[PDB]
Design an enzyme around this catalytic site. Structure first.
Site, PDB file in Angstrom:
ATOM      1  N   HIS A 166       0.810  -1.220   0.000  1.00  0.00           N
ATOM      2  CA  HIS A 166       0.000   0.000   0.000  1.00  0.00           C
ATOM      3  C   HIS A 166       0.844   1.271   0.000  1.00  0.00           C
ATOM      4  O   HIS A 166       0.260   2.337   0.191  1.00  0.00           O
ATOM      5  CB  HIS A 166      -0.976   0.015   1.180  1.00  0.00           C
ATOM      6  CG  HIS A 166      -0.463  -0.666   2.411  1.00  0.00           C
ATOM      7  ND1 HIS A 166       0.116   0.021   3.456  1.00  0.00           N
ATOM      8  CD2 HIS A 166      -0.467  -1.974   2.773  1.00  0.00           C
ATOM      9  CE1 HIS A 166       0.437  -0.832   4.412  1.00  0.00           C
ATOM     10  NE2 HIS A 166       0.106  -2.049   4.017  1.00  0.00           N
TER      11      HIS A 166
ATOM     12  N   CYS B 194       4.717   1.651   9.082  1.00  0.00           N
ATOM     13  CA  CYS B 194       4.583   0.522   8.170  1.00  0.00           C
ATOM     14  C   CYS B 194       5.911   0.210   7.488  1.00  0.00           C
ATOM     15  O   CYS B 194       6.681   1.109   7.135  1.00  0.00           O
ATOM     16  CB  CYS B 194       3.488   0.812   7.132  1.00  0.00           C
ATOM     17  SG  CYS B 194       1.807   0.924   7.867  1.00  0.00           S
TER      18      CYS B 194
ATOM     19  N   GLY C 263       3.292   6.095   9.785  1.00  0.00           N
ATOM     20  CA  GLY C 263       4.626   6.039   9.217  1.00  0.00           C
ATOM     21  C   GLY C 263       5.474   4.868   9.664  1.00  0.00           C
ATOM     22  O   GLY C 263       6.619   4.743   9.207  1.00  0.00           O
TER      23      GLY C 263
HETATM   24  C1  LIG Z   1      -4.209   0.424   3.947  1.00  0.00           C
HETATM   25  C2  LIG Z   1      -4.097   0.203   5.441  1.00  0.00           C
HETATM   26  C3  LIG Z   1      -3.505  -1.191   5.664  1.00  0.00           C
HETATM   27  C4  LIG Z   1      -3.148   1.243   6.041  1.00  0.00           C
HETATM   28  C5  LIG Z   1      -3.082   1.061   7.563  1.00  0.00           C
HETATM   29  N1  LIG Z   1      -4.387   1.316   8.144  1.00  0.00           N
HETATM   30  C6  LIG Z   1      -4.614   1.059   9.421  1.00  0.00           C
HETATM   31  O1  LIG Z   1      -3.774   0.589  10.196  1.00  0.00           O
HETATM   32  C7  LIG Z   1      -6.036   1.345   9.863  1.00  0.00           C
HETATM   33  N2  LIG Z   1      -6.602   0.084  10.296  1.00  0.00           N
HETATM   34  C8  LIG Z   1      -7.721  -0.432   9.791  1.00  0.00           C
HETATM   35  O2  LIG Z   1      -8.331   0.146   8.894  1.00  0.00           O
HETATM   36  O3  LIG Z   1      -8.176  -1.606  10.294  1.00  0.00           O
HETATM   37  C9  LIG Z   1      -9.460  -1.937   9.750  1.00  0.00           C
HETATM   38  C10 LIG Z   1     -10.592  -1.123  10.409  1.00  0.00           C
HETATM   39  C11 LIG Z   1     -11.022  -1.460  11.692  1.00  0.00           C
HETATM   40  C12 LIG Z   1     -12.054  -0.716  12.276  1.00  0.00           C
HETATM   41  C13 LIG Z   1     -12.640   0.340  11.569  1.00  0.00           C
HETATM   42  C14 LIG Z   1     -12.212   0.685  10.284  1.00  0.00           C
HETATM   43  C15 LIG Z   1     -11.184  -0.057   9.714  1.00  0.00           C
HETATM   44  C16 LIG Z   1      -6.007   2.214  11.089  1.00  0.00           C
HETATM   45  C17 LIG Z   1      -5.178   3.457  10.806  1.00  0.00           C
HETATM   46  C18 LIG Z   1      -7.463   2.567  11.452  1.00  0.00           C
HETATM   47  C19 LIG Z   1      -2.118   2.066   8.175  1.00  0.00           C
HETATM   48  O4  LIG Z   1      -2.448   3.242   8.346  1.00  0.00           O
HETATM   49  N3  LIG Z   1      -0.911   1.573   8.460  1.00  0.00           N
HETATM   50  C20 LIG Z   1       0.106   2.441   9.055  1.00  0.00           C
HETATM   51  C21 LIG Z   1       0.454   1.975  10.480  1.00  0.00           C
HETATM   52  C22 LIG Z   1      -0.760   2.313  11.382  1.00  0.00           C
HETATM   53  C23 LIG Z   1      -0.835   3.812  11.602  1.00  0.00           C
HETATM   54  C24 LIG Z   1      -1.562   3.876  12.953  1.00  0.00           C
HETATM   55  N4  LIG Z   1      -0.970   2.748  13.710  1.00  0.00           N
HETATM   56  C25 LIG Z   1      -0.528   1.848  12.821  1.00  0.00           C
HETATM   57  O5  LIG Z   1      -0.004   0.781  13.115  1.00  0.00           O
HETATM   58  C26 LIG Z   1       1.322   2.621   8.124  1.00  0.00           C
HETATM   59  O6  LIG Z   1       2.372   3.054   8.601  1.00  0.00           O
HETATM   60  C27 LIG Z   1       0.941   2.969   6.893  1.00  0.00           C
HETATM   61  N5  LIG Z   1       0.684   4.243   6.599  1.00  0.00           N
HETATM   62  C28 LIG Z   1       0.274   4.503   5.340  1.00  0.00           C
HETATM   63  C29 LIG Z   1      -0.022   5.699   4.815  1.00  0.00           C
HETATM   64  C30 LIG Z   1      -0.432   5.842   3.495  1.00  0.00           C
HETATM   65  C31 LIG Z   1      -0.529   4.699   2.722  1.00  0.00           C
HETATM   66  C32 LIG Z   1      -0.206   3.477   3.303  1.00  0.00           C
HETATM   67  C33 LIG Z   1       0.183   3.400   4.576  1.00  0.00           C
HETATM   68  S1  LIG Z   1       0.626   2.066   5.544  1.00  0.00           S
END
Ligand SMILES: CC(C)C[C@H](NC(=O)[C@@H](NC(=O)OCc1ccccc1)C(C)C)C(=O)N[C@@H](C[C@@H]1CCNC1=O)C(=O)c1nc2ccccc2s1
Ligand SMILES: CC(C)C[C@H](NC(=O)[C@@H](NC(=O)OCc1ccccc1)C(C)C)C(=O)N[C@@H](C[C@@H]1CCNC1=O)C(=O)c1nc2ccccc2s1
Lengths: 305, 305
Positions: free
Chosen positions: A41, A145, A143
């Protein structure tokens, strides 16, 4: 003596961390030989994440679209491919700091160190366990990830985890280094939740052995139990069933302390049924389950790398 | 989100660790520029340690008596001197891996990472605090002496601790990198004990702020308190007095959460007087005092190095 939550030395993994940028998005990548691994992603915008079509997004990218930075040196991407939930970027320069390494898929109950990174720079290192519900109890911000989890066996770094996402109740989910998620989760911003978790029984026992090795002995009772009677009790308190494989794995700690595994099971059974009465074990007021038997042995033996 | 006990990345310090042998004794040394620092009792036999005359023991040693190993490369010692409880060995080769560094003497209540080493090889990394009684709650076996404690500020490694000895109840004592002990202890095998310890109040408050930042909020009550009334209560429960310096240091966490420091003091006061009623805060069943305000901020801000 003393017993602390202890991470592996992180230097070998530090020399592998790079910053990957694709358009607006910047996260961490793992540089080994001439390949950089990061979460797929990295190609998503914030709108994209609600329901990403990853193949459609990736065809619209060239090699030049990926800005890979190691230190203040830009690495030229000369190839790219997608493997499950991971992106592989071939670069024209092999990492001179590449350690001997392998990619492994760990099992629930096993532990590893996390090197938490931001913008390809190491922030800190901590230990955690793959929970029975295939989440980890991490510490991760925006950030993070692409941060990875690893073990060091001898001089070989066994990469087992790359961080992707955070789930309800503040727990975390990710993939092995082939991009296959641990658990049933997907790299998409849609509601999902982990199943109910369970206590890692064999780890609790390993931690009680560590307590005894360190002279914290008040909870040892005079009884024994069969494996079956122990598991009937532990099930009630949401503890994993103890298997013969688990008993075997505890052999070294049993021999070191002279306490049979089933006797220690008797002592844990009384702790579960009666509580700890305001007392502590190794400075903790509840039973700890994120030390494996190998962690206890390594720490109470001084195994080096 | 999530909050873990977190160490600094250890790679910069890993590239500095060497093995120092003098006759029968082998421990760890710190190699910076063309100087190796290690504990002076590297010159002791087991009989020597009961009451060592260090000056008499050192005159009987030549440069060739010290075997310094970095990896599988022997470093030639060309000079040696004693500074307090530390030995300084000049070698003919400067460490090419020397980081930007400084030597600091930390204060009680401050934290640092320990890279635990055996035979000059890194075993693991953990975080601990300089306790108010000038001990640390470490994890150290035979052969760990010369392991160091450090912080990383920007790109500069601030060495603050070198490990020397273990004290009753399994706590640990050591020196700064000038060889001056923390606390009233001496590097001699004769009975000594640390004074009674106290809880690091400002750190407990920082940890309650971390809890709030992570959504763990049940303990916040509706009251406030003066600084004086809080300290009268905390003294009863063996908590350090909170100073205005401490209040100031908590400013950033107060502003982030919108909770005034004296309001959080009111909430801690109720926790001390009533207990936590079988509940947990950030997965812990007692109040944690080994996270500084800077640790909380760094972790809940993703500060990198
Ligand atoms: C596409 C997803 C995997 C991204 C990933 N989403 C979630 O983690 C959501 N999780 C989630 O939607 O679960 C499902 C859900 C559950 C309940 C309700 C709605 C949805 C969370 C923020 C809410 C995500 O932001 N990854 C972070 C690490 C994150 C940041 C905060 N703590 C963490 O560890 C990472 O660094 C990344 N940044 C970016 C920025 C831009 C592009 C890519 C990435 S990849
Ligand atoms: C000379 C002293 C400083 C050595 C140092 N003594 C104590 O720590 C004693 N402490 C103690 O006598 O306190 C006073 C006391 C209190 C009560 C009763 C009697 C005496 C402890 C083992 C009992 C010591 O062995 N250092 C260890 C680290 C140690 C090992 C185990 N856990 C730890 O952290 C270290 O690696 C070193 N190895 C050697 C080996 C040979 C030569 C030098 C060294 S230096």
């Amino acid at each position: 003596s003393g017993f602390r939550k202890m991470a592996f030395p992180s230097g070998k993994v530090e020399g592998c961390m790079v910053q990957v940028t694709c358009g607006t998005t910047t996260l961490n990548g793992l540089w080994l030989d001439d390949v950089v691994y990061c979460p797929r992603h990295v190609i998503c915008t914030s709108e994209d994440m609600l329901n990403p079509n990853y193949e459609d997004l990736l065809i619209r990218k060239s090699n030049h679209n990926f800005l890979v930075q190691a230190g203040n040196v830009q690495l030229r991407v000369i190839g790219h491919s997608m493997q499950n939930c991971v992106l592989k970027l071939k670069v024209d320069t092999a990492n001179p700091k590449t350690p001997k390494y392998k990619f492994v898929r760990i099992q629930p109950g096993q532990t590893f160190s996390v090197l938490a990174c931001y913008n390809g720079s190491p922030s800190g290192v901590y230990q955690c366990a793959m929970r029975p519900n295939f989440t980890i109890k991490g510490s991760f911000l925006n950030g993070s990830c692409g941060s990875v989890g690893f073990n060091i066996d001898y001089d070989c770094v066994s990469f087992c985890y790359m961080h992707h996402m955070e789930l309800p109740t503040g727990v975390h989910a990710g993939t092995d280094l082939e991009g296959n998620f641990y658990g049933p989760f997907v790299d998409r911003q849609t509601a999902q939740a982990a199943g109910t978790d369970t206590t890692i029984t064999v780890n609790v026992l390993a931690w009680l052995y560590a307590a005894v090795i360190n002279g914290d002995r008040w909870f040892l009772n005079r009884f024994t139990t069969t494996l079956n009677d122990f598991n009937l009790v532990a099930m009630k308190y949401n503890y994993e069933p103890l298997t013969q494989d688990h008993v075997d794995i505890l052999g070294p700690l049993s021999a070191q302390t002279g306490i049979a595994v089933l006797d220690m099971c008797a002592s844990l059974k009384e702790l579960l049924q009666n509580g700890m009465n305001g007392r502590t074990i190794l400075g903790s007021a509840l039973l700890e389950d994120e030390f494996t038997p190998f962690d206890v042995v390594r720490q109470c033996s001084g195994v080096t790398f």
